[PDB]
Design a protein around this ligand. Structure first.
Ligand code: MG
Lengths: 134, 61, 62, 375, 384
RNA sequence: AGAACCUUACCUGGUCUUGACAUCCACGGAAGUUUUCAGAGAUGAGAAUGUGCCGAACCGUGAGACAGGUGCUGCAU
RNA sequence: AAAA
């Protein structure tokens, strides 16, 4: 019953994911191959969040989610890391459509009842990372 | 139907060469997967099967 | 007494048990004895090929 | 966790001194490997895992050590049984008892082909190599941070090649004597492969890494019997890397730390920038040199002959011209912006790196290591 | 050859089954070590080396292995015995028999301190290191080409370090299972201590070797990667007051991958130009003479010919030579200020003859001489 | 018994690799001779004009024996 | 588990 943000297809048995599943007991290489086979369609290099569901018989199923908004905002602005001092140092610029584009994909993981509400969550996400909206 | 390897004890090096071009897995990975037959290697099947069958590697589509 | 270690290279440390013999060293003051190479804890000189018996070196296996 | 337990035939201890001694014949006569497992399993089928006296008298070495390492329900144990029949019979006996005393466990047996100790040429060539493959497979399929080598069972000759794996990869090894009662995490002296000895072989492995096969005679002509184990004969007149070879190839491929050096032109230029910029450049080069991730980030425009520029950051008064040889990070020039701009202005027209290395002996060399005793 | 065999209590196997198990307590209740070993020796003195059946059945491990390795009078046998009471007793029994079976042999028994399997902390900190130091000392003493390890006796945990030593020194090892009938030359792979991950740290280790301890913050700066600190955690040890020092494991590795020294040479800027210009005449001789002087204080004391003020003195390698050096000793560093020839040396003596010249040079210390680089050069194109 | 360039052996920068200067080998070209463009020049490219002596004149290219050194020691001479 |  663990939640991870492993890479798009770079699901190594490496320490980023390796020891996490070990305490439960699921086969490490089994999950790594299963995750990659369905995330090949995902754009390259994305920390797609997956929630693992392990059982008592040492079996597991997992569900993948849309990429995090902060990741989507980082690629939308063409940057790699956020502002060190958000709302003090400004490190990018994205249009409202770029907010709509990110909101639409994350709408599968949002909770707002409208595109405007979903956007405002993304707008709040943008301010918290120093990315101003332009 | 995914391409799988049944038997490759004839010209093991050539089968590695095929999957090297076919997939690009490194020499360690490519040799290990060939020696760990059977396993899922990947008209599309026929293309690599012809090269595999050329050196005597068995193919199961 | 002070004893002189001949040859090239040795393996003598403190608390080593060695055999000394007579023979002074001309330029070293106060040294009147020699250490017997190849006897007791003193090992022979390595790679010696001539005058081996003087340095405790067994004949090469050829 | 995962326990890579070596398996030894201490389980069938109860048949000690009885007329047919416990040998591969004895397993054979009673029916076979599976049939003999039940007979062995009977003698200690009752003993517990929490009872101290049974741990030290009535159970195998794998069971005693595993019970001491704290085997639980959520665990996975591997038994590297021997190739001999008496070895495998006990393997099928330990597993039944382990899957009985701790239900919900996953024990699987690997039969290391040709692990017999009655023949030398086979053991030197197929035993340790196969055992080296099997262990290095499980560690790489479960991560170095989760495997615990258990070199207590089995022959005394496998133990060198279990612990040595632990030292190289990083997994620990835990041992416990029969009469003792304390687990002993064996010391792990940091070791690696001798780069100096192995460096000339780099082009040789390069062919194999590309064409995946080389004719044997050409391999022998190209290249000291220790190097032989690095190479496994595929069998059709070619040779490919043995499992040890893949370790060496990766060791000769992993990036390492670097120690900066300064050409005679850099040392003249560093000092005149020290007065205006404190001791900032001294730390930066050392910081970049001893961090591979930092080095790969800062590569500005790359020049010929393996030269590539570095810079502290945006709007800085220094940009370095460095290149790598062995474990040394040679520094050729250290220039400010205007000199840097003109060089790149010149390099637009023709080649640049050729002109620098051409005058290496007259102007730059010798490179002096970056240790300073300013006082 | 010289055989560095380990020892174990296989020699006393005929006592298996008796109500008091043969162990440390048993030797204690049989009149100390000497009394038991004689008694044990009597229990297998009638076994014959040529007897194949008695070799496997009745004799010990070391005797059996050595018999297969061809032990004769012209060989030296060294037995390493565990610190335990019974461990020493069984080794002695073997030494007695080996003299009888091979008269004219030179067999010494060696005791390793702390080599016991009852204390976890003592074994892995002192027992293994003492054992490792014993073997490395003996290999160097006898020299390569004559030592062959025999790791068939003793505890299973001493085996890895016996074999690992074999790879470091290129020393073959051999083993023989009891029911087997063939020696098994253990494979050897080209492994070595981690030179790659320590050469970047040479400035700190040299300081720690001379100065007792260094601050940890200095050490932390030296290792940025988390993995590097995780791997090299065992070598260092906290000494108190926010400092670290080489743990006894570290002192073993460092005293193996680094030659001994007394002073670390350094060059001023003016010396560096002086050395480079003289390379056309004296070749590499100035580099060798500087390192030799810095290595041995006895040589440095010989070279002093004229002493200036403020602690500067001149070194001359002797009559018939041309070069001469102006050096001074600070802490543990051998600072080199100038390197001159025969003609200039006379002038520099004339100036000091009239006025103080030692004070003139030290006056210009921060303007012409410092900072002092270290005498490590790299001219040829080659990388390890 | 005579440093503005040259001398010049030194410095910065641009450049050459059997080579500025020799003997050979092969292959290819009379030698020389008006010019144009790029470059600080070295040099590079292109276009004209010659194409004789009787194989040698001079030449360009390719390989390697070699050339080359005002480099050290006048305490080897 | 001091020649599995
Ligand atoms: Mg004269």
């Amino acid at each position: 019953y663990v939640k991870l943000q492993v890479a798009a297809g770079m699901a190594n048995p490496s320490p980023p994911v390796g020891p996490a599943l070990g305490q439960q007991g699921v086969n490490i290489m089994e999950f790594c191959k299963a995750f990659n086979a369905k995330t090949d369609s995902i754009e390259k290099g994305l920390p797609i969040p997956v929630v693992i569901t392990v059982y008592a018989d040492r079996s597991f199923t997992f569900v993948t989610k849309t990429p995090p908004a902060a990741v989507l905002l980082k690629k939308a602005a063409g940057i790699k890391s956020g502002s060190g001092k958000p709302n003090k140092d400004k490190v990018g610029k994205i249009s409202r459509a770029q907010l709509q584009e990110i909101a639409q994909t994350k709408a599968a993981d949002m909770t707002g009842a409208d595109i405007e509400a979903m956007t405002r969550s993304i707008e709040g996400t943008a301010r918290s990372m120093g990315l101003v909206v332009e | 139907f995914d391409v799988i390897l049944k038997a490759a004890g004839a010209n093991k090096v050539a089968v590695i060469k095929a999957v090297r071009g076919a997939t690009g897995l490194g020499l360690k990975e490519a040799k290990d997967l060939v020696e760990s037959a059977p396993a899922a290697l990947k008209d599309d099947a026929e293309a690599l099967k012809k090269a595999l069958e050329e050196a005597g590697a068995e193919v199961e589509v | 007494v002070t004893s002189y270690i001949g040859g090239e290279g040795h393996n003598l440390q403190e608390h080593s048990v060695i055999l000394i013999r007579g023979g002074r060293v001309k330029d070293l003051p106060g040294v009147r004895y020699h250490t017997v190479r190849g006897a007791l804890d003193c090992s022979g000189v390595k790679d010696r090929k001539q005058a081996r018996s003087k340095y405790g070196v067994k004949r090469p296996k050829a | 966790a995962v326990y890579l337990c070596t398996c030894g035939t201490a389980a069938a201890k109860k048949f000690f001194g009885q007329t047919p001694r416990f040998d591969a014949a004895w397993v054979t006569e009673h029916g076979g490997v599976e049939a003999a497992s039940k007979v062995i399993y009977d003698t200690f089928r009752t003993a517990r895992l929490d009872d101290e006296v049974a741990l030290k008298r009535d159970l195998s070495a794998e069971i005693h050590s595993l019970a001491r390492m704290g085997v639980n329900d959520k665990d996975t144990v591997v038994l590297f049984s021997s190739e001999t029949a008496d070895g495998q019979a006990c393997a099928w006996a330990v597993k039944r008892y382990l899957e009985q005393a701790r239900p919900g466990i996953l024990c699987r047996i690997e039969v290391v082909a040709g692990l017999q100790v009655t023949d030398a040429h086979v053991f030197r060539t197929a035993g340790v190599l196969n055992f080296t493959k099997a262990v290095l497979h499980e560690i790489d399929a479960n991560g170095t941070g989760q495997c615990v080598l258990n070199p207590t069972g089995g022959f005394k000759s496998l133990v060198p090649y279990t612990v040595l794996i632990g030292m190289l990869r990083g997994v620990p090894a835990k041992y416990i004597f029969e009469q003792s009662s304390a687990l002993i995490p064996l010391p792990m002296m940091p070791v690696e492969f001798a780069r100096s000895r192995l460096e000339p072989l780099r082009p040789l492995l390069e062919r194999i890494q590309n064409e995946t096969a080389i004719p044997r005679a050409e391999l022998d002509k190209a290249l000291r019997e220790i190097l032989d184990s690095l190479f496994e004969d595929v069998g059709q007149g070619q040779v490919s890397l043995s499992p040890v070879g893949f370790l060496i190839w990766e060791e000769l491929e992993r990036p390492t730390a670097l120690v900066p050096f300064l050409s005679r032109r850099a040392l003249d230029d560093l000092l005149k920038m020290r007065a205006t910029e404190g001791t900032a450049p001294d730390d930066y080069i050392t910081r970049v040199a001893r961090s591979p991730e930092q080095l790969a980030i800062g590569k500005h425009e790359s020049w010929s002959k393996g030269l590539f520029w570095l810079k502290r950051g945006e709007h800085t008064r220094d940009r370095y011209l460095v290149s790598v040889e062995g474990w040394r990070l040679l520094v050729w020039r250290i220039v400010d912006a205007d000199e840097y701009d003109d060089l790149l202005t010149q390099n637009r027209k023709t080649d640049a790196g050729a002109r620098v290395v051409a005058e290496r002996r007259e102007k730059y060399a010798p490179f002096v290591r970056l240790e300073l005793y300013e006082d």
